[PDB]
A paper describes a structure:
Beta-2 microglobulin (β2m) is a 99-residue protein, physiologically acting as the light chain of the major histocompatibility complex (MHC) class I. β2m displays a classic immunoglobulin fold, and is well conserved among vertebrates. β2m tertiary structure consists of a seven-stranded beta-sandwich; according to standard nomenclature, β-strands are named from A to G, and loops are named after the neighbouring β-strands. The characterization of β2m structure and folding dynamics gained considerable resonance when the protein was found to be responsible for Dialysis Related Amyloidosis (DRA). The mutant protein is the etiological agent of a previously unknown systemic amyloidosis, whereby patients carrying the D76N mutation accumulate large mutant β2m amyloid deposits, especially in internal organs.
Residue D59 falls in the DE-loop, which is a hot spot for β2m stability and aggregation, its side chain is not involved in any interaction with adjacent residues. Given that β2m thermodynamic stability and aggregation propensity strongly depend on DE-loop backbone geometry, expectedly the side chain substitution (D to N) does not affect β2m fold stability. Among the DE loop mutants previously studied, D59N is the first variant where only the charge of the DE-loop has been altered. Thus, the DE-loop appears to withstand removal of a negative charge without sizeable effects on β2m structure and stability. The D53N, D59N and D98N 3D-structures superimpose well with both wt β2m and the D76N mutant (RMSD values in the 0.10–0.17 and 0.63–0.73 Å range, respectively); most of the backbone structural differences, relative to wt β2m, are located in the protein region comprising loops AB, EF, CC’D and the C-terminal tail. The RMSD values suggest that the three variants match more closely the wt β2m structure than that of the highly amyloidogenic D76N mutant. The D53N, D59N and D98N variants, which match very closely the wt 3D structure, show a similar Bz-score pattern, with positive peaks corresponding to AB-, CC’D-, DE-, EF-loops, and the C-terminus. The crystal structures of D53N, D59N (this study) and of D76N variants match closely that of wt β2m.
Author numbering: 0 to 99
The structure:
């Protein structure tokens, strides 16, 4: 057996073909086992509608999740990714840096 803690990155992107749209992204990488819970948070509250959840693996024991959705950030709102995994005794919350 092998278990690996996810790396968690939170960032925003504008699709070049539609530059006024903005997406909040949580890239959860290199984890095993594949069982996992991932949410985007807005002001501590789970975002229920997340448009894209793309899971892949490289080696049979390394998984990758891109979890993202359109959003409209205001300088007052706080966003984050929350991840639960067997390797994490407490849920891990990674805050979005607004300049990322």
């Amino acid at each position: 057996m092998i278990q690996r803690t996810p790396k968690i990155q939170v960032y925003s992107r504008h699709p070049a073909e539609n530059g006024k749209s903005n997406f909040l992204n949580c890239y959860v990488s290199g984890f095993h086992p594949s069982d996992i819970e991932v949410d985007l948070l807005k002001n501590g509250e789970r975002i229920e509608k997340v448009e894209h959840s793309d899971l892949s693996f490289s080696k049979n024991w390394s998984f990758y999740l891109l979890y993202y959705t359109e959003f409209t950030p205001t300088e007052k709102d706080e966003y984050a990714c929350r991840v639960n995994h067997v390797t994490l005794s407490q849920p891990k919350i990674v805050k979005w840096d607004r300049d990322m």
